[PDB]
Design a protein around this ligand. Sequence first.
Ligand SMILES: Cc1cc(C)nc(Nc2ccccc2)n1
Lengths: 171, 173
Amino acid sequence: PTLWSRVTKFGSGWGFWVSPTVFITTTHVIPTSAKEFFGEPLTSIAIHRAGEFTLFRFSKKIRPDLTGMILEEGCPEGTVCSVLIKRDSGELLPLAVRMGAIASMRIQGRLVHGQSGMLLTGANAKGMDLGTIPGDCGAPYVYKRANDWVVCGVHAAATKSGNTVVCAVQA
Amino acid sequence: APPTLWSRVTKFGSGWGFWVSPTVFITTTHVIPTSAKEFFGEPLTSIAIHRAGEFTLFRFSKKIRPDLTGMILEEGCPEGTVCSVLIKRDSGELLPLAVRMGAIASMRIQGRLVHGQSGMLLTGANAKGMDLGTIPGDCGAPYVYKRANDWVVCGVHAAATKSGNTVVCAVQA
Ligand SMILES: Cc1cc(C)nc(Nc2ccccc2)n1
C-alpha cells in the first residue's frame, strides 16, 4: 500500500488518485483532443475546473485497490509539504517545499494563481535530483497531519532559476 | 542520478553495497552475512577486508565488475553538502532521497551505539516511514553528490532515528 502508486502519468504531465473514482491534475497537461480517459467515455466523466486545478469524478471504480484520502483547498501558511515527483527514468523524487500565501505570481512572464511555495533543497540542483522540471506538472502536494495523509493541490509552475513553485488548489 | 551510479548499487545480505571500481566494494558492516566464506565466487583468502565500525571495504584480487570505471571515495563531505542516498525499492523504483549533511556524531539509536556523519532529510517534515524516509532494508545504500564535473561517493547508510528525520552515513577512516 503506497502514496506513490496513486501518482499516474497523464497527458503532458501527471495526476493523482484521491480515491477509486476521483483523479486530480493540472489543467494545462490535459489533452484537448479525447473521447475517453482510463477507458471510460468522456460522456460519463464529470470535469470540475478552477484555473490550473482540475478534478475528474468517474461513474465507476477505476482504482478499487485504493482507500479515499483527505483533499483540502491548500494548507495553512508555513506548512512543509512534499511534492511527489515521478520521472520517466523510474526515479521517485519527494522534495520538501515550505508553503506561503495564496497569490497571483509572475512565473517566467506569465500569471499563475495558487499557493506559493519555496523549495527547501538549497542553492541549486546542478545535475542533482533537487528541483522541478516542466514535465513534472500535475504531481501532488502532500503532508502528514495526525495519522492521516492530506493532499492539498497539484504542481502548476516553477521559476526556471530560483526557489519558487505554484501549487494549484481546489475552489 | 546517472545510470552508471544506479548500476553500482547491489543487493547484499540484509541490505545493499556499492562498487567504487572493478575491484572495490563498500557496505554497512551489520548487513554482511556473518557465516559467509565466499563473495562473488571468491574465497576470503583472495579478498582484503578493511572494517572501521559500521564501514566495510572489500578489495578483490581480480576484476569482479570490469564494466565499471573507478570513481572517487572520500571520508564524508563538508557540512552543508546536499547528498542523494541511492535507495532501490519494490519494483525497479529508484528513490534518490535528498539529505543535508552535518557534523560527525556519536548517537544511541534503538539501543545500538552508532558513529558516523549525521544528516537531516530534505524530503518533507515528518519522514517516518517508507514514502518519504528510510527503512532498515536500505542499510548499505550509498551517499553521493556532484562536485563540479564529477560525482563523489562519501559513505553508506547505517541508521535512522525513530522520528526518521536524522540519518547516519558510515564513513571510511
Ligand atoms: C527554510 C525554513 C525556514 C523555517 C522557519 N522552517 C523551515 N522548515 C523546514 C526546513 C527543512 C525541512 C523541514 C522543515 N525551513
